[PDB]
Amino acid sequence: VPFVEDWDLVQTLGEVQLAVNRVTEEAVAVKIVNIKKEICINKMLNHENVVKFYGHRREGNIQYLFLEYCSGGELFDRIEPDIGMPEPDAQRFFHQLMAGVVYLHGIGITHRDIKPENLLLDERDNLKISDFGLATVFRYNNRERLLNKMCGTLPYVAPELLKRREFHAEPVDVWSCGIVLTAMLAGELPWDQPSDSCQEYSDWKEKKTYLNPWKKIDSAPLALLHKILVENPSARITIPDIKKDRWYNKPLKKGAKRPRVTS
């Protein structure tokens, strides 16, 4: 099959470029560059809510990561500033985020930088966790390794990452998912960082939910955020319990409209 291995770089996505196959016209994302770990972790991954890794090629000092193209773009761009998005859309995206995070944690991988810029959407609006550049193995040979490195983006980091020397990996990803859920429902980030010097963070711990972003959020998803955004990571809700929450299991969204005729 001649020219089947030839890909044309047609546009920049985020360096990340959209590549189109010369013969088949298949669209892929290619990332051009810690890096050895990123490729290793990517080779472990296979899930419908995790951006697919096709392979890698090294041209001297440049690494080319061949990854799944997500035409829907970033979840970030589905969030209307100060508004968010319809609650059924946010619930569906939150379900898909949980399936992807359950998968990652199940194989002992923590993403460490979950935010809407890293949550991509395919052609059918299916959420895909992306960018495994900060990701690490927290469970190996069924032995959990406690983390100590500062990783992430301050508005999304769990408070234990700033207060404690060591912390468990899984509650940190759970916390950032709750900040993502907040962003989806209110179109704003609740604080700059989860610290006592942050008035907004201090107000949330004081249960001042009559303030923004919380007053824009319905009591059923807000009750879930009350269980996720818990300062003590040991008292914080786990994903198996998130899956039992009332809003998580609340019927809200119809399926993808399917073509139909009458009479």
Ligand X SMILES: Oc1ccc(-c2ccc(-c3[nH]nc4c3Cc3cc(O)ccc3-4)cc2)cc1
HSE (side-chain half, CA atoms, 13 Å) at 10? 14
Long-range contacts of 95-98 (CB under 8 A, 24+ apart): 95/248, 96/49, 96/126, 96/127, 97/49, 97/127, 97/129, 97/177, 97/180, 98/177, 98/239, 98/242, 98/243, 98/248
Q: Shortest distance, CB of residue 135 to ligand X, whole angstroms?
A: 7
Q: Shortest distance, CB of residue 184 to ligand X, whole angstroms?
A: 17
**Structure tokens of 234?**
């040991």
What DSSP element (H or E) covers 56? strand 53-59
Beta carbon nearer to ligand X, 135 or 225: 135
Beta carbon nearer to ligand X, 49 or 225: 49
Q: Is 16 marked within a binding site?
A: yes
Positions that interact with ligand X (CB under 6 A) = 13-14, 16, 29, 31, 38, 42, 51, 67, 69-70, 73-74, 120, 130-133
- 196 labelled catalytic: no
Report d(CA 233, CA 215) in Å as an integer.
25
Q: Is 31 marked within a binding site?
A: yes
Q: Shortest distance, CB of residue 79 to ligand X, whole angstroms?
A: 13
SS3 state of residue 162: helix
Q: Which of 82, 113, 131, 196 is catalytic?
A: 113
Looking at beta carbons, which residue is closest to ligand X? Answer: 73
Beta carbon nearer to ligand X, 66 or 248: 66
Residue type, 262: T
Beta carbon nearer to ligand X, 42 or 176: 42
State CA 1 to chain mean position distance. Answer: 38
Q: Shortest distance, CB of residue 68 to ligand X, whole angstroms?
A: 6
Residue list for the binding site for ATP: 13-16, 31
Active site residues: 113
